[PDB]
Each structure stands twice: as C-alpha cells, then as structure tokens.
Design a protein around this ligand. Structure first.
Ligand SMILES: [Zn+2]
Lengths: 94, 116, 19, 106, 79, 102, 80, 96
C-alpha cells in the first residue's frame, strides 16, 4: 500500500528554487518518472563501467564517468561540479 | 579613402635577406558501384584516417596512444556510418525526382534520422 | 558592400592598395 | 538524536533512498557510501534546472501551478535537456510551436 | 587539415559503396564536418572510458564500448 | 447589379489559423472511445479477453499521438524537400525508410 | 471488435497532422497513416500482452504499456 | 606468466558449424564476429530477463521469464523457432 516516490523531495527543491509556485500531480508524476529514468540510466552505465573495469563496487567515481558519459554537454559539467561539492560536504560532515 | 595592405611585408626582397573510346558519364560510375559494393576492403586510406583521429582526440586528452585495432575500429565504424548515411541520402534524392546527392539532401536525412 | 581584390588592377601584383 | 545523510550532504533529495535503490537494483555487488550521495546530488540538479526552466515557462503563461505542458516547453526549448529527454515523450506536452518558412504566406 | 586528409575520391568511394551516382561538389565538404562531429562523439566517449581505467592508451575494446553506448554496436573487434 | 459574395478565407488561411490553434492545445486529438476500440481489436489478436485499464488506453494513445505527430513532422520536412506543400504517401515512407522501421 | 481503425477519422488524422505542422494533406495519406498507427499500436500492444501474461495478469495494465514503449525506445512519462 | 584465460565460445561455435555445414570452416575474423554476436544477444536477452523479474517484484530468473524475454526481443519466426527448441532442451535436461 505504501508507495515510494520523490514527492516531497522534489517539492522541497522546488520551493528552494521557487518558494511561490504550485505543481500539478500529473506533472509531478512526470518529474518522478523522469528522475527515476535518469537514475536508471546513470546507475546502469555505472554498473557497466564497473563490470568492464573488472571492479565490483559503485564508487562515486563511476557515477561521474557515467554522468559525463550520459548527461550531454554542459548539463554534465554542472552536474559533476554539484556532485563533487556534495560529496565534499558529505565527507567534511562525515 | 579605404586602403588595405596585401604585400604583408614591411620591406621588399625578403628572400635576399640574412634572416579514343570513352564511356558515357555514369556507366563507369555504375561499374564501380558494383566494384565497391561487391568489395569489403576499407575505402578511406588508413594513415590519413588514423591522423584524423590523433588531431581530433588530442582535444579530449593529450598523449593518448591508440591500439592499432582501435584506429581500425574507428575506420570500420566511420565507413559503416557514412555508407548508411549515403544510402539514405541517395533516397532523399531519388525522392525529389533527381539523381545527384546534394548537401541539402543530407542535412535532411540526418533530421529524419534524428541525428540532429 | 564588396571586398576588393588582393592584387593590383594595373600590374597584377600584391602590395599596399588604394581601394 | 539521529541526523539524516542528506543534511550531512546538504541536499533535498534523499540520499538514503538512493542507496537502497542502488543496492536492490543490483547494479553492482557492493555499493560505497559516497555513490548515493553523488547520485542524489546530480538528480536534484537535473530536477532543478528542469524545474527552473518550467518556472520561467509558467509565469509566462500566467499560471500559478505547473501543468505538464510547461514541462515540455522547458525540455524542448533547451537544447541540452532535449538531448537527454530526447526519446522521451512527456504527457500532455503538445509540441513546440513551429511552422516552416515556405509555409508562410508571401 | 588532417581533416582535409579525408580526400574527395575517398568520399566518392564512400558514395559509390553507398550507391550514389552523382555527387554534388559541395557534398564533399559537408561530409567532412559530419564525419568529424561523429568521430568527435565516439572518440570522446572512447576516452571517458579510457580515463576511467586510468589507462592512458585507448583500446579497440573501449572503441566498440563507446559505440555500444552511442547505440551502433560493432561486431568483429572484441566484446 | 452588385451581387453578394460570402466571406471565405483563402485556401491556407483557415489552415494556418487552426495550425496555431492546435499547436497550443495539449489535448488529445484522436477521440478516446474510438481509440479504445482500436485496441480491443488490436489486442484480441494477441490475447483473448484482455481487459484494459482506463489508463493503459490513455497511455497507449498519448504514445500514439506523440509518435504520429513526430512522423508527420518529418513527413512535412520530406514534403518541403521536393519543394512541395502537399504531403504524399511516399513521404511518410521516405521518413520511415530512414528511421529504420522499414 | 472489427475494423475500428476507421475510428481514427480523417478529421482527426488531420488534426494530428495539423498538429505536426502540415498544411496540405493529400488524400492517400489518411489510409497510409492509419496503417502506421496499426503497426505501432501493434508492436506496443503485443509487447504489452506479453508483459501481461508474464505477470499472469489479465488486465492489461498501463504499467505494462509504459514498459513496452520503453523497449521500443519511445519512453513515456506521466504514468509510472 | 602465461596469459590468463579469455572467455570465448569459439570452440562451441565450431561444433555447431560442423553440425550444419560439415565441410566448412570459419576464419578468425568471422569467428570473433560470432563471439561478439553471442555475447551481445546473450547480454540483450539476459538484461531483459532481469527487468522482467524486477518489474514483477520477484527476484529469480527462471525459464518462464526468459521464454518471455527471448520472445520480446528475438523477432518473429526466430522467436517461435527458439522458444520451441528451448522448451525441448529444458525438458530433456529435466528428463535426467
Ligand atoms: Zn600596381
């Protein structure tokens, strides 16, 4: 019965961006399926990379080689940058 | 009065310084349609192709050696891509009551292919 | 507008030109 | 007192969830700690650029909420999000308004 | 200029294998740019893969691997 | 003397007007019930008495209109390719002879 | 039932093509298109009745439809 | 430092090449083509099996869910002319 989805999380980041704007539920589902799909593509490529390099673990590195192999053009640079500063804050806060 | 400089030389004399049977157009073309279609060898002279890859990969990472089989993989892949694109272009031409591929015929194909 | 030529129209040689 | 991993990473998307999923997804045998943190970091970004662009689209059509339509504009107007979401067909999007020049009257 | 190394008669040979009987003259130079941008896509990914293995040399395996990503698999060179 | 003449927009004005009308609509075009039935007879051939949700149909449509509006779009470019404003069955065919379904 | 392809009426095939930005739809297109709708809807629905049976379900689900569209490449957002 | 073992189905592709065209050999290049073929189509069908399973919220690749995916991938006759041989082969396995 419990349905797991990214409802409140995308809503939060929406207010972080625009703390005045509503969202449609169908449009939400567009967002949820979209983040699920891009998550699948980034995680799959990563799994592959690993299996090619005879590794066995999905390091933050793979997710990068991946984000830079999937996300196109600039969308990547800004993804990397934000992912690197995010993992930097994760290791700084331990 | 507009003026321009073309010699591009402040001084002259720079060198002296201290510092018969003939087929109709198309018959030979169709003959070597048959020749390059029955054949399987690789049509872009290799060395030139390898170089194309060195000067173009240089951008993504310097000092990147390429296994020989690789530049042969780039050739095969490139010739396959272009022969597929050229089949499509011939079609995009035979479409418009014509028999001469033209640039426009390939800016379109690639749009329908979605490779743009 | 039109771009002039890179050679003299009188002697057919390069140099500084009056366009 | 237990804090969440997202506040450790400074994110809004869940880093915890994206670990489970990564694990049960069996994308690979072992998953490290920083991999779900980075993925949540990239997903929120992509969810943000797309939400911003949707916010730029909506106000234009003077609509408070964000109907699925706006999400298409945002995606098809942008030339990056369009390569990403390029074989994707959003619900109730319509198409970018466009008519060819030869179809215009003289 | 290494691009101009992809010569006309070579583009003509590709057209012949492609079944084209009359090639415009302006095609030759369009086929270069299209060629470049495509190679410039594979080789890019070929190298992302390369600098993931911390390898400095690229392999044909990485090349067909980048093709698999793009979509156009290549049989005959490994994998 | 002066005989009347009704006000008729010239061939193409009504066309482009409803083009601008329809490229702002997101609403589905093919009507629902007619489409729903399209499937029950396109499915009965694959499995009997396959019920269908009222969402599978809506999805299998959104996906269809989307597929068709894409193909028409490449059909048009293909029609303009021969310097013509009329699309032809060959166009839907050249287009599809290049996407690789044919 | 039978021959309900005619339900995608010409008025509509047009509206779609109109949506696609065409101005003059030749006749002999209305038939071609319906044929294209019935090769697409075929494959998708087939890959959906296969998914349907695998789950030993009977009710073709919208969930299956989406997965089917993915296989062929035409992913659809808005349903799951 | 003998080179490590490289996985290949080459040895196998030959047995089958002998069970079809007995007096015919293959060239290295064509064999390697065939190995890339079997690896690619195996990865395709095995990846489909995976999702089929995950979708149905179950976790085990079995024979059912692969008859299903080979069908979903291999197209047309190929599919039927496979699933039949596959069920035979499975029953002959389970036979003994
Ligand atoms: Zn002079």
């Amino acid at each position: 019965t419990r349905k797991e989805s990214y409802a409140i999380y995308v809503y939060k980041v929406l207010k972080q961006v625009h703390p005045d704007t509503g969202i449609s539920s169908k449009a939400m589902s567009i967002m949820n399926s979209f983040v699920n799909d891009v998550f699948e593509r980034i995680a799959g490529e990563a799994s592959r990379l690993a299996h090619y390099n005879k590794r066995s673990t999905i390091t933050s590195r793979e997710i990068q080689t991946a984000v830079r192999l999937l996300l196109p053009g600039e969308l990547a640079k800004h993804a990397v940058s934000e992912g690197t500063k995010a993992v930097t804050k994760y290791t700084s806060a331990k | 009065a507009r003026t321009k400089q073309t010699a591009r030389k402040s001084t002259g004399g720079k060198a002296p310084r201290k510092q018969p049977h003939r087929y109709r157009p198309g018959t030979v073309a169709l003959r070597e349609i048959r020749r390059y279609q029955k054949s399987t060898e690789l049509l872009i002279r290799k060395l030139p192709f390898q170089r194309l890859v060195r000067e173009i990969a240089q951008d993504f990472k310097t000092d990147l050696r390429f296994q020989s089989s690789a530049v042969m993989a780039l050739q095969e892949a490139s010739e396959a891509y272009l022969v597929a694109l050229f089949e499509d272009t011939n079609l995009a031409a035979i479409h418009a009551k014509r028999v001469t591929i033209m640039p426009k015929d390939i800016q379109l194909a690639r749009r329908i292919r979605g490779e743009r | 507008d039109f771009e002039n030529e890179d050679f003299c129209s009188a002697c057919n040689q390069s140099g500084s030109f009056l366009c | 007192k237990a804090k969440t991993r997202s506040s450790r990473a400074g994110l809004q998307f869940p880093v915890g969830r994206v670990h489970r999923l990564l694990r049960k997804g069996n994308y690979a045998e072992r998953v490290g700690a920083g991999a779900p943190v980075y993925l949540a970091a990239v997903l929120e970004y992509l969810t943000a650029e797309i939400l911003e662009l949707a916010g730029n689209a909506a106000r234009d059509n003077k609509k408070t909420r964000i109907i699925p339509r706006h999400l298409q504009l945002a995606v098809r107007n942008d030339e990056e999000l369009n390569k990403l979401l390029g074989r994707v067909t959003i619900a109730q999007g319509g198409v970018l308004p466009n008519i060819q020049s030869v179809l215009l009257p003289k | 200029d290494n691009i101009q190394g992809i010569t006309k008669p070579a583009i003509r040979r590709l057209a012949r294998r492609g079944g084209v009987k009359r090639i415009s003259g302006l095609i030759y130079e369009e086929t270069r740019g299209v060629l470049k941008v495509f190679l410039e896509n594979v080789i890019r990914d070929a190298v992302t893969y390369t600098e993931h293995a911390k390898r400095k040399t690229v392999t044909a395996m990485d090349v067909v691997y980048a093709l698999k990503r793009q979509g156009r698999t290549l049989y005959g060179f490994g994998g």
